[PDB]
């Protein structure tokens, strides 16, 4: 797709889980249910504004769910909870 230097898919959302976090645990699996209802809102937002870039939910459990789906970009050290955009919304200066 254009304005997206990668290959994307609008049919669903991708979920990133950091390496140090084991997917399949009770905390992570319980997070994958109530975050599955975010995909419909993700699609609805893009329909109103087609010129919409990544929209992502950063969980306190660690996983980040973003739309549209796209494969993740050595080893991976990304943690959504340490990103500058997550930190400013988690507290005040």
């Amino acid at each position: 797709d254009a304005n997206f230097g990668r290959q994307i898919s609008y049919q669903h959302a991708a979920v990133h889980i950091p390496t140090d976090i084991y997917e399949g645990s009770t905390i992570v699996l319980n997070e994958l249910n109530w975050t599955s209802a975010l995909d419909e809102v993700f699609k609805k937002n893009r329909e109103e504004d087609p010129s919409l870039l990544w929209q992502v939910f950063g969980s306190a459990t660690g996983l980040a769910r973003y739309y549209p789906a796209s494969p993740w970009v050595k080893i991976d050290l990304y943690d959504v909870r340490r990103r500058p955009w997550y930190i400013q919304g988690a507290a005040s200066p």
């Binding site: 390496t19 140090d20 976090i21 084991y22 997917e23 399949g24 645990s25 080893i75 050290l77």
Partner: protein, 96 residues
């Protein structure tokens, strides 16, 4: 003939080791388990992949699996306790 004379000592020392092994089982039964990364302390969270830093350097990470492993010499039962206690009597690896 020499074995027959020393045959009485080998009965007392085998009884003493057996009693110590039974005591050792009561103390360290199943308590020698540990995870591959020294940050998880039970089998529930000792799963999946973790990031290992080679020689303690923060600039050289590497991905490794974490496994809830058991000690090679342990006190899970009397047979394992006696084998673990025999190696102690030889003074090999007993500090470990």
């Amino acid at each position: 003939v020499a074995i027959r004379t020393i045959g009485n000592i080998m009965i007392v020392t085998t009884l003493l080791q057996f009693m110590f092994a039974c005591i050792g089982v009561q103390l360290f039964k199943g308590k020698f388990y540990r995870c591959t990364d020294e940050a998880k302390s039970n089998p529930e969270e000792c799963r999946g992949l973790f990031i290992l830093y080679k020689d303690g350097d923060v600039d050289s990470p590497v991905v490794r699996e974490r496994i809830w492993q058991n000690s090679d010499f342990n006190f899970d039962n009397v047979l394992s306790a006696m084998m673990a206690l025999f190696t102690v009597s030889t003074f090999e690896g007993w500090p470990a």
